[PDB]
Design a binder for these strands. Structure first.
Ligand code: MG
Ligand code: MG
Ligand code: MG
Length: 135
RNA sequence: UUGUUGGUUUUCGGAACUGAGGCCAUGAUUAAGAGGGACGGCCGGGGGCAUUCGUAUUGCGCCGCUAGAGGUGAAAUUCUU
Protein backbone atom coordinates (compact mmCIF):
# COMPACT_ATOMS: atom_id res chain seq x y z
CA UNK A 1 0.00 0.00 0.00
CA UNK A 2 3.02 2.23 0.47
CA UNK A 3 5.44 3.65 -2.09
CA UNK A 4 7.60 1.40 -4.24
CA UNK A 5 11.02 1.74 -2.58
CA UNK A 6 14.11 -0.43 -2.50
CA UNK A 7 14.51 -2.50 0.66
CA UNK A 8 17.85 -0.81 1.31
CA UNK A 9 16.04 2.54 1.48
CA UNK A 10 13.34 3.90 3.78
CA UNK A 11 10.51 6.41 3.43
CA UNK A 12 10.30 9.42 5.74
CA UNK A 13 7.33 11.01 7.47
CA UNK A 14 6.89 13.95 9.85
CA UNK A 15 5.40 13.39 13.30
CA UNK A 16 4.01 16.58 14.82
CA UNK A 17 3.86 16.00 18.57
CA UNK A 18 1.86 18.62 20.46
CA UNK A 19 2.33 17.78 24.14
CA UNK A 20 0.28 20.14 26.27
CA UNK A 21 -0.51 19.87 29.97
CA UNK A 22 -4.13 18.89 29.04
CA UNK A 23 -3.61 16.44 26.12
CA UNK A 24 -1.06 14.90 23.77
CA UNK A 25 -1.31 14.91 19.97
CA UNK A 26 0.62 12.40 17.89
CA UNK A 27 0.14 13.52 14.29
CA UNK A 28 2.07 11.99 11.39
CA UNK A 29 2.02 13.70 7.99
CA UNK A 30 4.05 13.55 4.80
CA UNK A 31 7.19 15.64 4.32
CA UNK A 32 5.19 18.66 3.16
CA UNK A 33 2.92 18.28 6.19
CA UNK A 34 -0.14 18.97 4.05
CA UNK A 35 -1.39 15.38 3.90
CA UNK A 36 -2.14 13.36 7.04
CA UNK A 37 -1.42 9.65 7.70
CA UNK A 38 -2.72 9.26 11.33
CA UNK A 39 -3.57 11.65 14.19
CA UNK A 40 -4.21 9.80 17.50
CA UNK A 41 -4.44 11.85 20.74
CA UNK A 42 -4.14 10.98 24.39
CA UNK A 43 -7.85 11.66 24.84
CA UNK A 44 -8.69 8.97 22.28
CA UNK A 45 -7.23 6.27 24.60
CA UNK A 46 -8.41 7.14 28.14
CA UNK A 47 -11.91 7.58 29.61
CA UNK A 48 -11.01 10.22 32.22
CA UNK A 49 -10.17 13.86 31.27
CA UNK A 50 -7.51 13.95 34.02
CA UNK A 51 -5.48 11.24 32.18
CA UNK A 52 -5.51 12.83 28.65
CA UNK A 53 -2.01 14.26 29.30
CA UNK A 54 -0.75 11.18 31.15
CA UNK A 55 2.49 9.59 29.91
CA UNK A 56 0.66 6.27 29.61
CA UNK A 57 -2.00 7.83 27.39
CA UNK A 58 0.68 9.42 25.23
CA UNK A 59 2.43 6.05 24.89
CA UNK A 60 -0.73 4.25 23.76
CA UNK A 61 -1.43 6.95 21.17
CA UNK A 62 2.10 6.78 19.77
CA UNK A 63 1.61 2.99 19.38
CA UNK A 64 -1.57 3.42 17.23
CA UNK A 65 0.18 6.08 15.16
CA UNK A 66 3.12 3.64 14.72
CA UNK A 67 0.93 0.75 13.46
CA UNK A 68 -1.09 2.92 10.98
CA UNK A 69 2.07 4.68 9.72
CA UNK A 70 3.67 1.24 9.04
CA UNK A 71 0.55 -0.32 7.41
CA UNK A 72 0.21 2.80 5.19
CA UNK A 73 3.97 2.35 4.63
CA UNK A 74 5.88 5.01 6.65
CA UNK A 75 9.17 3.60 8.09
CA UNK A 76 10.98 6.69 9.47
CA UNK A 77 9.76 9.91 11.09
CA UNK A 78 11.02 13.44 11.54
CA UNK A 79 9.95 14.64 14.97
CA UNK A 80 8.59 18.16 15.52
CA UNK A 81 7.83 18.62 19.21
CA UNK A 82 5.92 21.63 20.48
CA UNK A 83 4.39 22.89 23.70
CA UNK A 84 1.37 25.19 23.86
CA UNK A 85 3.53 28.15 22.89
CA UNK A 86 2.24 31.65 22.26
CA UNK A 87 1.69 33.45 25.56
CA UNK A 88 1.36 30.04 27.26
CA UNK A 89 3.98 27.62 28.60
CA UNK A 90 6.99 26.65 26.50
CA UNK A 91 7.96 23.43 28.29
CA UNK A 92 6.40 20.40 26.56
CA UNK A 93 3.88 18.50 28.63
CA UNK A 94 4.35 15.16 30.38
CA UNK A 95 3.34 13.18 27.29
CA UNK A 96 6.18 14.44 25.10
CA UNK A 97 8.71 11.85 26.26
CA UNK A 98 6.42 8.82 26.25
CA UNK A 99 5.14 9.51 22.74
CA UNK A 100 8.68 9.81 21.40
CA UNK A 101 9.84 6.88 23.52
CA UNK A 102 6.95 4.74 22.26
CA UNK A 103 7.65 5.59 18.62
CA UNK A 104 11.26 4.41 18.86
CA UNK A 105 10.26 1.31 20.83
CA UNK A 106 7.54 0.50 18.28
CA UNK A 107 10.10 -0.21 15.56
CA UNK A 108 9.72 3.26 14.03
CA UNK A 109 12.89 4.81 12.64
CA UNK A 110 13.69 8.32 13.86
CA UNK A 111 15.10 11.06 11.66
CA UNK A 112 15.66 14.63 12.85
CA UNK A 113 14.14 16.02 16.06
CA UNK A 114 13.35 19.72 16.40
CA UNK A 115 11.26 21.93 18.74
CA UNK A 116 8.60 23.99 16.86
CA UNK A 117 6.88 25.77 19.79
CA UNK A 118 5.54 29.11 18.35
CA UNK A 119 7.58 31.79 20.23
CA UNK A 120 6.25 35.39 20.17
CA UNK A 121 8.58 38.42 19.82
CA UNK A 122 6.33 39.72 22.69
CA UNK A 123 2.57 39.59 22.08
CA UNK A 124 -1.03 39.74 23.32
CA UNK A 125 -1.62 40.12 27.10
CA UNK A 126 -1.57 36.72 28.86
CA UNK A 127 -4.70 35.44 30.69
CA UNK A 128 -4.81 35.76 34.49
CA UNK A 129 -4.55 39.41 35.34
CA UNK A 130 -1.62 41.17 36.99
CA UNK A 131 -2.22 39.24 40.18
CA UNK A 132 -2.06 35.98 38.27
CA UNK A 133 -3.90 32.70 38.70
CA UNK A 134 -4.36 32.65 42.48
CA UNK A 135 -5.01 28.94 42.83
C1' U B 1 41.50 150.51 50.12
C1' U B 2 39.82 159.13 47.95
C1' G B 3 36.29 161.40 54.95
C1' U B 4 33.05 168.83 52.02
C1' U B 5 28.66 165.83 48.91
C1' G B 6 27.68 163.30 44.36
C1' G B 7 30.56 161.26 40.33
C1' U B 8 34.49 157.67 43.16
C1' U B 9 40.57 156.81 39.36
C1' U B 10 39.14 152.81 40.83
C1' U B 11 40.96 148.46 42.96
C1' C B 12 38.89 144.68 45.79
C1' G B 13 36.74 139.09 46.91
C1' G B 14 33.30 135.56 45.60
C1' A B 15 29.95 132.98 42.16
C1' A B 16 29.10 130.93 36.80
C1' C B 17 30.45 129.78 31.39
C1' U B 18 34.81 128.78 28.44
C1' G B 19 40.12 127.54 25.79
C1' A B 20 44.98 125.72 25.71
C1' G B 21 48.24 122.99 28.87
C1' G B 22 51.26 120.14 32.16
C1' C B 23 51.04 116.34 35.59
C1' C B 24 49.40 112.00 38.16
C1' A B 25 53.84 104.93 37.62
C1' U B 26 47.64 108.24 34.89
C1' G B 27 42.85 105.14 35.91
C1' A B 28 40.09 98.03 35.03
C1' U B 29 42.45 92.97 41.67
C1' U B 30 42.24 87.96 40.76
C1' A B 31 40.41 84.22 37.32
C1' A B 32 37.30 80.24 42.74
C1' G B 33 38.50 71.89 42.75
C1' A B 34 31.54 79.10 42.42
C1' G B 35 28.62 79.84 38.20
C1' G B 36 27.06 81.09 32.97
C1' G B 37 28.35 80.81 27.94
C1' A B 38 31.75 79.18 23.47
C1' C B 39 34.25 75.30 21.21
C1' G B 40 35.93 69.87 20.47
C1' G B 41 35.28 64.66 20.00
C1' C B 42 32.29 61.43 21.92
C1' C B 43 28.11 59.08 24.67
C1' G B 44 23.01 57.36 26.22
C1' G B 45 16.10 51.94 26.28
C1' G B 46 16.65 60.84 27.02
C1' G B 47 12.28 63.55 23.98
C1' G B 48 9.18 64.47 19.27
C1' C B 49 7.69 62.99 14.12
C1' A B 50 7.85 59.64 10.23
C1' U B 51 9.32 54.74 8.66
C1' U B 52 10.57 49.45 8.82
C1' C B 53 10.61 44.54 10.54
C1' G B 54 9.47 40.40 13.69
C1' U B 55 6.92 36.19 15.35
C1' A B 56 2.78 35.38 18.26
C1' U B 57 -2.61 35.93 19.55
C1' U B 58 -7.52 36.20 17.02
C1' G B 59 -10.56 35.75 12.86
C1' C B 60 -11.27 33.97 7.73
C1' G B 61 -10.64 31.03 2.87
C1' C B 62 -8.84 26.45 0.73
C1' C B 63 -6.77 21.56 1.57
C1' G B 64 -5.63 16.76 4.62
C1' C B 65 -7.09 13.25 8.08
C1' U B 66 -10.10 12.34 11.81
C1' A B 67 -13.70 12.11 16.80
C1' G B 68 -12.99 14.21 19.79
C1' A B 69 -11.22 19.23 21.57
C1' G B 70 -10.95 22.47 25.62
C1' G B 71 -10.61 23.43 30.65
C1' U B 72 -9.63 21.65 35.80
C1' G B 73 -7.68 19.32 41.95
C1' A B 74 -11.92 16.79 39.61
C1' A B 75 -15.31 18.82 36.61
C1' A B 76 -18.95 21.51 33.96
C1' U B 77 -20.49 25.73 31.30
C1' U B 78 -18.16 25.81 25.89
C1' C B 79 -16.55 24.13 20.53
C1' U B 80 -17.57 19.90 17.51
C1' U B 81 -19.23 14.53 11.36
MG1 MG C 1 -7.37 17.03 29.78
MG1 MG D 1 -9.77 17.13 27.00
MG1 MG E 1 -0.72 29.95 47.28
Amino acid sequence: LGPQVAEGENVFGVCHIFASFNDTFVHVTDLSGKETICRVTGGMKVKADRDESSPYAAMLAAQDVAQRCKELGITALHIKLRATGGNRTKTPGPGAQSALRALARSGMKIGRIEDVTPIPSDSTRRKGGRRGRRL
